[PDB]
Design a protein around this ligand. Sequence first.
Ligand SMILES: OC[C@@H]1[C@@H](O)[C@H](O)[C@H](O)c2[nH]c(CNc3ccccc3)c[n+]21
Ligand SMILES: [Br-]
Ligand SMILES: [Br-]
Ligand SMILES: [Br-]
Ligand SMILES: [Br-]
Ligand SMILES: [Br-]
Length: 837
Amino acid sequence: NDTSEVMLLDTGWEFSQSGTEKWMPATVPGTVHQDLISHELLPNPFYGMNEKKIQWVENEDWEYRTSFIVSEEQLNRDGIQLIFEGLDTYADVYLNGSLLLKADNMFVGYTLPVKSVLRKGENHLYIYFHSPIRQTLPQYASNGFNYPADNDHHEKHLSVFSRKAPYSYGWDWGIRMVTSGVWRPVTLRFYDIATISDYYVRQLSLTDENARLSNELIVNQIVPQKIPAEVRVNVSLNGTTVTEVKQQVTLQPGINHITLPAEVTNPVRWMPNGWGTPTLYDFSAQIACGDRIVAEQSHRIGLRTIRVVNEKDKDGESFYFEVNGIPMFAKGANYIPQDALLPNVTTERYQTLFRDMKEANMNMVRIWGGGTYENNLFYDLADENGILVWQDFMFACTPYPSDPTFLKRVEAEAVYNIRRLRNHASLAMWCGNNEILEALKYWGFEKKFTPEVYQGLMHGYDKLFRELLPSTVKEFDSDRFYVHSSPYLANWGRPESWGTGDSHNWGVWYGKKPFESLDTDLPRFMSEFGFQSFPEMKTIAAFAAPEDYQIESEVMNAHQKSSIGNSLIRTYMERDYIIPESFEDFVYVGLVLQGQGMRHGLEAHRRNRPYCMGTLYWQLNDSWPVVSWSSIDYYGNWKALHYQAKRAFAPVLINPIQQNDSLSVYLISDRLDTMEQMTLEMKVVDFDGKTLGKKIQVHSLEVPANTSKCVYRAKLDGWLTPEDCRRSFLKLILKDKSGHQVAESVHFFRKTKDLQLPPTSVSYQMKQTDGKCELTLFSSMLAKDIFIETPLQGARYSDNFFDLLPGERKKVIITSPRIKKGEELPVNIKHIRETYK
Ligand SMILES: OC[C@@H]1[C@@H](O)[C@H](O)[C@H](O)c2[nH]c(CNc3ccccc3)c[n+]21
Ligand SMILES: [Br-]
Ligand SMILES: [Br-]
Ligand SMILES: [Br-]
Ligand SMILES: [Br-]
Ligand SMILES: [Br-]
């Protein structure tokens, strides 16, 4: 890119428990815990009851060291800069006898001038990590009260004192592994003249005819002389220059601010998943001094507008996203860290997770505030997949300190990550925290703390979430939306508040409300709602024994962290399904349950646009093997919920909704084009495959762009008897003028437990080659909610958790790199009727 040389300090690292004098090889970026595991100095933290057996680690201090060589030629470069993209958390960094840095915030990258401290030959780097617990014990003792952070799984709630990933201290789906280490890369850059400290491509305006941009560079010049330079910006698309601009300057020692306007005529816009291509331009800034390009930085840039509209209206206060001027109904999920040990998350795992969102027709992900500001790769993948990103700051569920030192650390991370992320097309909004305002209003505090301490907490809220964070966003990301808290007003126990802003409706699960309540309890935007399930058996076998297999054994409860657990799964299951006697069948039906109940809500929210303008379910993914609200387990396996979210988020959806012994059929489209001259066709089919009555035809339908509309209503009485309702289903297709199918749905008229399901044999043929299995499935009679189960971790399915309709063949492709020709894939097909006698 330029004349600099970058040395990655990713080898030759060793670590030691402080005070032992024993050193072992370590992997950096990494964690103390992984380094221990890799020498069998911890048990598999995820296996069994082993969580208690790993806790001692957080009490020790840990040292890391490496050495490296610098040449006489490198040492004579104008500048040499050591960069820590991440240190978790309290780290004293020494290089060749110099204390370079006393680090104290996991979420901040540190850039350090080191030329004057480096030596020709061997150079020695030592990092001392103070235990974040022992570091903060004296701070807690001075505080005189315990912050109410119930997800911090320790008697003393020390999490609140440290700018360290909240979930690391435990959460209601997570293991406590309070880890330390060099968690993101370390980089030594040898360079001449200057580095580009920041490059911000600021969009000033965008219309169909012109995008106007301001390229804002901050250049740190490291030599004593004034240096003539030319700044150049090249804008390209797919390798071809679109526009190019330049500016002469003379760079002064220290910081220089440079602004170059650029325009792209007839811009090709970045569109979200579902509405087109997520086009990205390549913007490259260079600093040229004489012949040499001494510094260069590039960003991929998406040209689009995002506006969050949050305005008083007749229904209360709206909360929705307008993308490229068009209201966009949000479809997605809440994202949590993908591992207890962040650096174990590989490039491949990030890529697969985005394939999983894109394939489920999502257009939004919330990076929830108990995790981390995600790495650059996460955002690059969001940009290239058309997925909008809601980014919480990293504060969740408790009030936090607001003393001057604490607020300076926070300001440092807010500036760092805002500048880090603000060039991403995907980045859509910032949210000050998760549930802290709700917590302060509703969760009991005025009777847990003195009135003085409670008042302090309330003024402390404002200092951080209503002043410091919104001011920082206004300064560094001024055209992006900020809201101080999610949910900002609406509270799930208070119906009167549901028309105001975004909701976390935990009436389902925590309030024990039936899934049917999601049809009536409607929000303006659902930013959280959820339901737990045990993960499938091959994941259970990664973490439990057949002994170790009851819903409330020590081990199952050890793998449940919500305030209840596993009893609640059984309670809800009983409402809708016959509860199976075996543990394996109970796991299967609980997957089915979570998928069917949650998709009922996803459909209610889309059906009720424009009152409701988004749904993000809790939660996408898992950080370890566990029972949780996730749609995808720790090993990448889609639960039923993920297949059902795909179906519910389909661009065009036929949604039959039955209430009060009556059926309505809604046609729901997130297409940018209107469909004309459409025909809905339906027919009742019993479980043996025989049609009941005649086909019903609704012709001449239009499905306008971005709308949900009722096209058919019929009372059940006079049409089907209670007996038929238990013994048949409705098949629904939507087709264009010429008979081409654009959508299909199936409807059942009774709860699954009330269906008279025939005993049946799902048979299959298989064609297996390397990487691939093609199965053809057949059953003469209905097989309900079939699960095609294979022991192969992370195998992918074209479909799963679907009703196999009577006498109707169904092709399913299974893929995995570990599918070998001639070593046939174990396949177990389960279905509802098989689970009881
Ligand atoms: O409990 C599941 C999820 C959480 O993991 C996550 O923090 C997410 O923001 C969230 N919000 C709630 C609702 N609020 C509470 C539930 C239980 C105890 C305290 C608060 C539930 N959940
Ligand atoms: Br330097
Ligand atoms: Br520097
Ligand atoms: Br300047
Ligand atoms: Br605010
Ligand atoms: Br009904």
